[PDB]
């Protein structure tokens with residue numbers, strides 16, 4: 709098993725993940741360094757899908773310099789047939805890590821929250837709203853959480869547990885605040901705010917219904933409780949912004 713990206717030879721070790729036209733592999737370069745290669749098959753992609761892919765690459769290549777909480781893209785090879793992307797290899801995705809770990813450390817949680825705010829803050833600064841944030845979008849690379857994608861290109865497929873109420877009616881940087889809040893709620897209470905509701909139509913109804921009060925059990929971290937209360941406001945106008953979350957005592961205290 710082997711492959712070439714811009715003349716540089718990579719030895720395939722394992723297949724990290726799979727998609728529709730996409731395949732992610734854990735590779736090794738000529739200098740025995742470990743990387744992640746994303747392979748995209750364009751042999752079925754239409755011109756709208758191709759441009760969504762070119763856009764996502766350009767943005768990932770641009771926001772590279774702006775924040776270290778954005779996944780490294782070292783090199784890429786684009787042909788009509790295929791896209792090969794030499795990226796940084798992570799240990800695990802946040803979703804996989806949270807599915808494994810029974811108890812999550814409060815210091816780990818703060819660190820992870822901080823990292824998510826910086827990554828999402830950086831994308832917003834360039835006019836990008838992910839609009840679909842889930843823990844699968846975040847990758848752990850040495851205790852550091854990194855944002856995998858920006859939601860531009862067409863791994864927790866079809867999840868409504870992190871969906872904002874405004875998205876269900878149909879979207880601003882505030883939409884990402886609701887999704888991030890759901891991720892933090894999961895790291896706090898062990899489940900997403902609407903995980904108890906199995907029926908998807910009933911679940912969607914609950915997110916958009918203000919008469920359905922979101923539960924906020926008492927925890928030693930009062931700062932943490934306020935963040936969740938501030939993020940999970942159904943009216944985006946009544947919801948806290950990313951620059952404000954970065955100045956919140958939970959992120960800055962101590």
Ligand SMILES: COc1cc(OC2CCN(C)CC2)ccc1Nc1ncc2c(n1)n(C1CCCC1)c(=O)n2C
Nearest residue numbers: 724725732734744746795796797798799800801804856
């Ligand atoms: C080998 O290291 C990993 C293991 C891992 O856990 C997998 C969970 C599922 N099983 C079947 C295999 C291990 C998830 C991500 C990584 N690292 C990683 N490092 C870099 C990645 C990247 N993933 N991904 C996808 C996220 C989920 C699947 C692939 C990427 O798109 N890049 C750029």
